[PDB]
Amino acid sequence: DTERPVVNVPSEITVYRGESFEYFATVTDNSNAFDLAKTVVRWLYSNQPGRGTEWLQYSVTQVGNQLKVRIFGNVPIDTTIGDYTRYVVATDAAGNVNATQTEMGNAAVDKTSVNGQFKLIIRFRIKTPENTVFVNNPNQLTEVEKNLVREAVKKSNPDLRAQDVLNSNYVTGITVSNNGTTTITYRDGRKDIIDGSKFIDT
Ligand SMILES: [Ca+2]
């Protein structure tokens, strides 16, 4: 047995602050025999969930000739928004691994991928304002009205901190168009858009 086990894991695992998550990976091997205790989910440097993502949990079972790796946890309300490279590293009974420590290191530095590699994305779960913002012209808000909109979005999303948005500044990170459509750009460059028509009226 020189054939390595193969992990099937989604390319992105997206989790939301203040919520639980649950995803699965699968492992197969020509031998159908595994070392479950040496099948882990980890960051590059050591067999650990990783700095900043200490809440990333996993558990492994065997179902027929495959492993199922449950990837789960509870995301703190104030963990950093952004993404991380993580790895499912599986071992077969013969000791073959899907990705070696050296391969993981090359992939990290070169920005290439190994089998079992996934991007862990921490997102904010945006909420549309509950209370309507009343404006004189819904197709052309005043600057005073756009600031009311920013305030409403901040009040409807109280766990969104200044350090969570672009440039760590609410004014740069939460931008309002002429019709009140609001883009929230997070510190990682990802964006959520709230269409003005869902909370703006005349
Ligand atoms: Ca094998």
Residue numbers in the entry: 399 to 600
Question: Which statements did the authors publish about this structure?
Answer:
Many streptococci adhere to protein-attached carbohydrates expressed on cell surfaces using Siglec-like binding regions (SLBRs). Siglec-like binding regions (SLBRs) are among the streptococcal adhesive modules that bind sialoglycans. SLBRs contain two adjacent modules: a Siglec domain, which shares some features with mammalian Siglecs, and a Unique domain13 with no close homologs outside of the family. The conserved sialic acid-recognition motif governs general specificity while sequence diversity in surrounding loop regions allows the SLBR to select between related sialoglycans.
SLBRGspB exhibits narrow specificity for the sTa trisaccharide, as have other previously-characterized members of this evolutionary branch. To reveal how similar SLBRs could include or exclude different sialoglycans, we determined crystal structures of these five SLBRs at resolutions between 1.0 Å and 1.7 Å. This included a structure of SLBRGspB with improved resolution as compared to a previous report. Finally, molecular dynamics (MD) simulations of unliganded SLBRHsa and SLBRGspB predict that these loops exhibit considerably more flexibility than other parts of the protein.
